Ligand binder design. Structure first.
Ligand SMILES: O[C@@H]1[C@@H](O)[C@H](O[C@@H]2CO[C@@H](O)[C@H](O)[C@H]2O)OC[C@H]1O
Ligand SMILES: O[C@@H]1[C@@H](O)[C@H](O[C@@H]2CO[C@@H](O)[C@H](O)[C@H]2O)OC[C@H]1O
Ligand SMILES: O[C@@H]1[C@@H](O)[C@H](O[C@@H]2CO[C@@H](O)[C@H](O)[C@H]2O)OC[C@H]1O
Lengths: 638, 638, 638
């Protein structure tokens, strides 16, 4: 059946093209495996809840915007009952029933690993012609808000400019009592009943209320204004839109924005763990998280029931925690051709779950051809990044590009452009960095007080757990570019490491013993054919590399809106260093996990196409793009 | 922490004895492992939703009535806005908002195995001073309702007396449109605003809205009027009160009544299957049910996470489907000392899920010392009755007492009084009927077109599945009593069976082959030391028995309210037949499941105590009570 | 490390090219992950037992014949100590110690589903210059054996010519006592000490004695003379060569022959079940088999640990039970480009486990491009043929080509040439027969007294179990060819079936009920675009077909040794039927299992290449080869 929803329809109608329903949730309550829901032009202020599941990729349930029509789903409501209090501060009042069981003005940003704990923030929000406001703590703070032009990035501890300084003068504050909710905001001179003013109301826009609602496709909608809660790996992880613990979703061609915390969630649900550290306080989140993994396994977490989602061609921005989030629920998924930006820039709250994309247990996840910029952290892989592949992505203007934490691999980062000043946070082992352009520092550190799971290949089955001893990384064909006043760009971080698994084994086995003997020897690194310009430093034992510390490539990423260009100068010597095609055959297996770098299907992986998808010969330029050559280079990269 | 709830309290209070909360759900939203909630006298019209789980039997969360106080939880509301329409018919009207998302007047009795499909019934109800009404189909049926005094028992096809004929004149009917719910009822002359008139409103009284809320004890409440839905093994199975897919609850000392369908549910939740036959219509519930078993297994169904509930010392009556119901969620549970009666007597709807107690997959469930009467069916064990023990129960005045269907055992039925005319529906194999008084017929039938699971011992692990070939039953020390014209009382049903596993094996292996050779031989039966009176007939190959077809025991169960007596005459020959103490050692293992009759803990089981819990010697009177002797017997049995 | 084994070697040697080992088992006791064992020219009389496992597809352990060298592994020994008894009968005697724990002359062909129980046969064998003998039951039968030229095919009950009639005069008989093994045989005039005479000695040739020895490649050997035991699905299933319950073997380019029972085994091991029906006799093999599936599941039977083997480019012939056999151990494997013939033609023993290839639980197994002829039965898929694809194979001169038993699909049989007179035994549902040439009858039957497992897609997880109700099959683009006096060729078998899942559901849901209602409606069949010649008959409701009862295609398969040709005449109308390219989108899902016809990786399957591997046009003619045309066709098919 092909159901139709239109602003001229009726939920008492048949749901056909000639007699369409009025609300999307109406169609969602009757559609079944194989059906399509076509939604016509209009703004739908409702939380859509798919009731029945698709039964296979062929028999999915498809929700999409009519061809050529602008369809918006919002979790907000326009408010036109504001009353001026004094100066530029206005107030509106709503009976609590307006929000029902979930009141964003009563709900707090709360949970494990949330660090901003003295100044409570809530899930509500006020918007003036689309621009969200800043929450303030007291009634008094509403009247003469101070314009701010700079802010502290918590992780890097650097003061950075505020993108939209003007927005800092727009503030809101709310009070919830037993009968009603009173919301105040400073509109700086505008008449809020006259301008287009909205407030957050619902938690989500498109998210099932039951787990297991598989095979749903959601396509071509603009979705916005969702009061989503802090979403750590140890709690339920709702988002503005998400599959809610199921399999085979396809979320594509949507423009998603203004989720209080995470926009798209492919995370876990409450049953396997729900902020026990923050609520019970008897054990840390670390201990509760490794436990949630086993609880999930007992609840059927496996390729047969969970994950294999596709997130593609979406534009996601202006969210406070992530554009994409998820612990466990995203295994085997694919995330590609997305444009992600402006994530967590307002910095109203901070904690260890913020990034454009953050995934825990991203087993065999493929993250490729995405454009991620203007985020405090572009991508964060945290625990169990096994089989994960980060390939052909464009990262720029981020406070940090990539962070892979407490993982054992094998994980692969290939043909990416990582152009931010702080490019890599590496607190893992078992990685392969192949043919990337890396223009920022790398912070590499062992993790000896936290042990995390590893798995059988291409599976959620647990094989064991390990600490991160550091090393056991591969670096081939990368172009590293330092900068005056920037330390740690390159691979010199591994100077004390062995250079082959055979060497590591010979050394460990020089004297009888067990664990202690292994801990006294540094793991091996496999590093060759990298270039180091403008101050980047090489691993001391690399055999074939190109080092020109005094050469400045003058790298620039030129963002012109729908298109982005890469500008880079390369020295004549660039022509004399040639890279090999890497593959399952050329990359040494990771030690602890004892597994190869292969395709998700178990077959050999061959890294022979570059960032621009051009096939390359056995000897070609190093770096992410085969076309780069000595001299001037100006290449369209998006 | 010991929380207090009282009608003088406040939900903004501390919840202490001096500053109590007002609603039980307020305490349920903050209590944590190890806390107790003490509720003071009053009627609490709310659905209590335990929020946090107990963490062990020691650290449970206890909800209880204050010592000596009458505490009532109801799902109904008193209505005093009725307006006379005409005659004795009155009407009230409520906004749909009054019911929230669950409206009993809109929600139908619906689902797999519901047979009364031409006459739509709903989950609502109307009560006059506690007496529920009969729903009618048309507005017109309200004005001159017919008093009925007899009704057809569906399974037995016998017309029987309606217990409360007067009640048949009180009828209701309702309509729900987009805005309002309108209820009409005939009050036969009473003034509904003057009398105490209530209507169903909420689905449950005490039921978590999340699964996994373990170790909760609910004690000393009267709970009533819940609009519970039709609960087959293939759907979500909510009830008036239940653990909702969790472990270790204790439901004791409560008085529960007027659940539309099932009162106490220890069943399954929606995720493992939800009326797929009725909704998708592509495969029968039979096929969907065996699938739900494997779906649950992948969803954690095991002794470590589900079951081990205790339901004791409760009185449960006036429910339309069951006093206790549940598929999968009741494994390893114990049900004892409960008084169950008046279950499904109104017969407003009928289907194959009705009985005082009905349990699917009652693995190792212990059902003992219960008083069950005035039910269309007392107990129904349907599928996987493995390790189940029905012992020392008192069944009387039921259209049928016990039904064990498509199970392979080993299941044990010992020391019971099955006094109804139709005592047993036996559509299984692997049973042991030891020391019972059986005074009604047995209908024994093979089931060759349905195969069902069997398990490893004391576990939910699946070992295989099988059809019911019939036989492979044990009958020792039972007293059978027929009645004029009543056929099939006794054990002659098995006349063609083999008499030992050795004989079955020898006959099967006479000619080479496989399945076909096994199917041509009847399974063995182990029958000895039974007495047959007043028409009961024995297995023709039984070696030691007492048959006195002409002797009438003049059996009578005298129910005097809180006490019940058994009146029974026995012949002088009764003294010459003596029974052995049966045990794991004396009961032959079941053939297909290949398991012994033992205790839930895997230890030897010895059946040396009778119905009155008196220890008995090796040679003792047969039947359920050792005190029974030749002559007159008048014994208190409750 | 590359180890070398040569007849000039020594097992005290280093095992290098210059200082090679002498036996292959010596290399097998020291080789580790990533090593290669190169065996040089010669005959190695030993059972090779791989000791250490390969660790991945990249780090396997490879055993292969040196390039261009003839390497033979045999389980036999040459005997030259024969003494003439009388006439042409000779005798040899050996110490029992010569056979060790396994004596072929003592061991019997024994076990579940073995039907020849009067005539005890043993696992030994005698060969004269490579030609095996027939065992006789009594000493006296040795002296004047009668030449036999015809024999009864047990299944078809037709008397057929004996291929090698002369071989019927060579017989052997043996006795084993406390000390010695004495073997007698009639050499019909030859001198066994002068000729090359061998006897079976060892059970296997290349088989680990431990399970889990994964990732082994065996290439380029000739292997022969193994005293392998009867291998039903309910027992241990050893073979001449096999992985013995592990994952990722590659058995290729070998010539394998004279395995007493099965040659290559990808079956199960003893712990999950071992002839309990035959040994305990309390339950049938059917019951013990369904149990073995669950026992294996608890023993880790899953894609992560078992299966994914590849058997390609081998020639396997002269085996008494199968060329390839296996229950459970072969999941997800691929079998292709093998030449299989002369399987079970001596008929010294018979039972329900015989076929060129027999697999139980062939989940997602791909069987393609195989040439299978001169077998009593070409291929037998028995239980759990889910996701199995039988494609582009050449079947001729077999008493029966294919048998798919008690499976529920989705299973695919496409682009095959099934040229024998008895082409298909179909005792399943859920099949799709696409673009085949089928020249023999089909026997299709329901199986209502045996229920068997089905699974989640692409997994060993159990989803349910079911009887075979019949139907729910698809037949598109097949060319059926009848023959005078041959009945049941075509698709008329399905005449009472519904024609769409919609029709089935509508009819079942005409009257309320459950299983009984579903049982009275015949499952749907999807049949169109088939041709029926020379007496083949169509499904009465097929909409687009070509029926020419009087047209005789005079099909003939001309076997010229290494090349095989197809000769076929087609009518002028042949090109009027235009076939569609089938795929996941065009094949209706199977009903009970509720799954689509997909690729093993879970993606869309498109059948767009023909038997000759030519890309097929959208508007193609039917049958297995797109180039078939009206008139004469003479095509090389091997
Ligand atoms: O379990 C995840 C953690 O691995 C991660 O937190 C890291 C360790 O704790 C902090 O002190 C570190 O700075 C941070 O990188 O995120 C929290 C949780 O998702
Ligand atoms: O699956 C359960 C059934 O075993 C049971 O239904 C039985 C079989 O169908 C009816 O024809 C029989 O009369 C009934 O006893 O209940 C339905 C379901 O819970
Ligand atoms: O379990 C497998 C059987 O399905 C199969 O036996 C079939 C059923 O019994 C016989 O009467 C049939 O002819 C045969 O096809 O093989 C035995 C076992 O492998």
């Amino acid at each position: 059946m092909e159901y139709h929803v239109a602003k001229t329809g009726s939920d008492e109608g048949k749901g056909t093209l000639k007699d369409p329903f009025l609300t999307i949730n109406k169609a969602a309550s009757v559609a079944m495996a194989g059906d399509t829901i076509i939604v016509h032009e209009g703004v739908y202020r409702e939380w859509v809840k798919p009731k029945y599941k698709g039964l296979s990729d062929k028999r999915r349930i498809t929700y999409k915007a009519a061809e050529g029509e602008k369809v918006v789903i919002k979790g907000s409501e326009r408010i036109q009952s504001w009353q001026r209090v004094e100066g530029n501060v206005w107030r509106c009042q709503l009976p609590n029933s307006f929000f029902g069981e979930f009141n964003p003005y009563k709900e707090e940003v709360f949970g494990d690993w949330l660090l901003t704990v003295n100044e409570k923030k809530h899930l509500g929000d006020v918007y003036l012609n689309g621009m969200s406001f800043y929450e303030v703590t007291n009634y008094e703070d509403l009247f003469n808000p101070q314009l701010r032009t700079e802010v502290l990035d918590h992780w890097t501890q650097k003061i950075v400019p505020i993108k939209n300084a003007e927005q800092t003068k727009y503030v809101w504050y709310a009070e919830v009592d037993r009968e009603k909710t009173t919301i105040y905001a400073n509109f700086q001179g505008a008449d809020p009943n006259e301008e287009f003013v909205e407030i957050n109301v619902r938690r989500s826009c498109f998210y099932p209320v039951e787990t297991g609602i598989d095979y749903i496709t959601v396509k071509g909608f603009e979705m916005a204004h969702a009061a989503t809660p802090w979403a750590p790996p140890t709690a339920d992880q709702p988002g503005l839109i998400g599959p809610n613990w199921s399999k085979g979703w396809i979320i594509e061609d949507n423009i998603i924005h203004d989720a209080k915390c995470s926009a798209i969630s492919i995370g876990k649900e409450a049953t396997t763990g729900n902020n026990y550290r923050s609520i019970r306080k008897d054990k840390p989140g670390y201990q509760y998280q490794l436990e949630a993994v086993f609880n999930a396994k007992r609840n059927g977490w496996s390729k047969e029931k969970i994950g294999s989602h596709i997130i593609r061609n979406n534009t996601i921005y202006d969210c406070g925690q992530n554009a994409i989030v998820g612990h466990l629920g995203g295994v085997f998924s694919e995330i590609y051709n997305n444009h992600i930006y402006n994530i967590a820039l307002k910095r109203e709250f901070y904690g260890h779950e913020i990034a454009g994309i953050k995934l825990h247990a991203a087993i065999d996840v493929q993250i490729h051809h995405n454009r991620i910029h203007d985020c405090s952290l572009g991508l964060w892989l945290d625990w169990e990044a096994q089989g994960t592949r980060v390939s052909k992505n464009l990262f720029y203007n981020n406070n940090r590009d990539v962070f892979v934490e407490v993982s054992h691999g094998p994980y692969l980062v290939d043909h990416n452009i990582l152009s931010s000043e702080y490019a890599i946070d590496n607190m893992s082992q078992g990685g392969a960095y192949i043919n990337n352009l890396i223009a920022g520092k790398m912070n590499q550190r062992k993790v000896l007080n936290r042990s995390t799971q590893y798995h059988l290949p291409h599976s959620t089955e647990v094989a064991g757990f390990a600490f991160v001893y550091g090393g056991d990384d591969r670096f081939y064909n990368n172009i590293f570019i330092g900068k005056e006043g920037l330390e740690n760009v390159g691979t010199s971080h591994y100077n004390n490491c062995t250079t082959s698994l055979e060497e590591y084994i010979e050394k460990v086995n020089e004297v009888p013993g067990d664990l202690g003997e292994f801990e006294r020897v540094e793991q091996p690194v496999y590093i060759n054919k990298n270039a180091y310009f403008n101050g980047a430093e090489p691993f001391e034992k690399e055999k074939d590399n190109l080092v020109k510390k005094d050469f400045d490539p003058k790298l620039a990423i030129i963002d012109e809106g729908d298109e982005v260009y890469l500008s880079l100068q390369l020295p004549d010597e660039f022509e004399n260093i040639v890279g090999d095609i890497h593959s399952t055959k050329t990359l040494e297996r990771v030690r602890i996990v004892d597994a190869e770098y292969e395709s998700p299907d178990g077959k050999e992986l061959v890294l022979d196409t570059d960032y621009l998808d051009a096939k390359k010969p056995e000897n070609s330029s190093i770096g992410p793009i085969a076309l780069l050559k000595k001299g001037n280079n100006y290449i369209k990269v998006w």
